[PDB]
């Protein structure tokens, strides 16, 4: 089983904004998770070929990863913070749905999700 095309990170049709909540999502939320020891499985689209996960994209129909998120943030793909928060939550959900409780990768996602929640609890006020 081949990999699918990755999620888009560029779309000139899509209206864009650069905003203080999006800026926080990049410089605080993404940066915190990206630097973590457990980030590496989440820093790029799942390569089902290299990882020998031939059923991954049969089960996961909304792939998402931090490499995509980082590019969406840096390339101002989003209109609002909720879009980006949803991408992180999609990524965590994918991991929990595909894998088994207690698997290493689920523990890794949990650790990142804890930090995500701690940072989005203090999402700033819109300017
Ligand atoms: C979170 C996505 N993911 C990736 C990362 S897919 C990847 N793509 C590329 N290019 N590098 N890593 N491995 C995964 C998964 C996933 O959901 N489920 C899995 O069982 N694996 C195998 C695995 C990898 C690392 C650890 Cl520590 C434990 C298990």
UniProtKB/Swiss-Prot annotation:
Substitution effect: residue 104 to G: Found in a patient with a neurodevelopmental syndrome; uncertain significance
Effect recorded for residue 99 to A: Abolishes binding to acetylated histones
Record's subcellular location: Nucleus; Chromosome
Glycyl lysine isopeptide (Lys-Gly) (interchain with G-Cter in SUMO2), cross-linked positions: 58
Posttranslational modification: Phosphorylation by CK2 disrupt the intramolecular binding between the bromo domain 2 and the NPS region and promotes binding between the NPS and the BID regions, leading to activate the protein and promote binding to acetylated histones. In absence of phosphorylation, BRD4 does not localize to p53/TP53 target gene promoters, phosphorylation promoting recruitment to p53/TP53 target promoters.
Domain Bromo: 17-123
Site for Acetylated histone binding, residues: 99
Coiled-coil stretches: none
Disease tied to this entry: Cornelia de Lange syndrome 6: A form of Cornelia de Lange syndrome, a clinically heterogeneous developmental disorder associated with malformations affecting multiple systems. It is characterized by facial dysmorphisms, abnormal hands and feet, growth delay, cognitive retardation, hirsutism, gastroesophageal dysfunction and cardiac, ophthalmologic and genitourinary anomalies. CDLS6 inheritance is autosomal dominant.
The protein's role, per its UniProt record: Chromatin reader protein that recognizes and binds acetylated histones and plays a key role in transmission of epigenetic memory across cell divisions and transcription regulation. Remains associated with acetylated chromatin throughout the entire cell cycle and provides epigenetic memory for postmitotic G1 gene transcription by preserving acetylated chromatin status and maintaining high-order chromatin structure. During interphase, plays a key role in regulating the transcription of signal-inducible genes by associating with the P-TEFb complex and recruiting it to promoters.
Domain notes: The NET domain mediates interaction with a number of chromatin proteins involved in transcription regulation (NSD3, JMJD6, CHD4, GLTSCR1 and ATAD5). The C-terminal (CTD) region mediates interaction and recruitment of CDK9 and CCNT1 subunits of the P-TEFb complex. It is also required for maintenance of higher-order chromatin structure.
Family of this protein: Belongs to the BET family.
Subunit relationships: Interacts with p53/TP53; the interaction is direct. Interacts (via CTD region) with CDK9 and CCNT1, acting as an associated component of P-TEFb complex. Interacts with RELA (when acetylated at 'Lys-310'). Interacts (via NET domain) with NSD3, CHD4, BICRA and ATAD5. The interaction with BICRA bridges BRD4 to the GBAF complex. Interacts (via NET domain) with JMJD6 (via JmjC and N-terminal domains); the interaction is stronger in presence of ssRNA and recruits JMJD6 on distal enhancers. Interacts with NSD3. Interacts with NIPBL. (Microbial infection) Interacts with bovine papillomavirus type 1 regulatory protein E2. This interactions may serve for the tethering of viral genomes to host mitotic chromosomes allowing successful partitioning of the viral genome during cell division.
Remaining remarks: JQ1, a thieno-triazolo-1,4-diazepine derivative, and I-BET, a benzodiazepine derivative, have been tested on tumors with success. Treatment with GSK1210151A (I-BET151, a I-BET derivative) has strong effets on mixed lineage leukemia and promotes myeloid differentiation and leukemia stem-cell depletion.
Protein name: Bromodomain-containing protein 4
Protein species of origin: Homo sapiens (Human)
Residues of the full protein shown: 44 to 168 of 1362
């Amino acid at each position: 089983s081949m990999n699918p095309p990755p999620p888009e990170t560029s779309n000139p049709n899509k209206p864009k904004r650069q905003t203080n909540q999006l800026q926080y999502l990049l410089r605080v939320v993404l940066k915190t998770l990206w630097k973590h020891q457990f980030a590496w499985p989440f820093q790029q689209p799942v390569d089902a070929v290299k990882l020998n996960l031939p059923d991954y994209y049969k089960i996961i129909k909304t792939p998402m990863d931090m490499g995509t998120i980082k590019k969406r943030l840096e390339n101002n793909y989003y209109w609002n913070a909720q879009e980006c928060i949803q991408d992180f939550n999609t990524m965590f959900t994918n991991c929990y749905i595909y894998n088994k409780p207690g698997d290493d990768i689920v523990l890794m996602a949990e650790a990142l999700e804890k930090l995500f929640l701690q940072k989005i609890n203090e999402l700033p006020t819109e300017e």
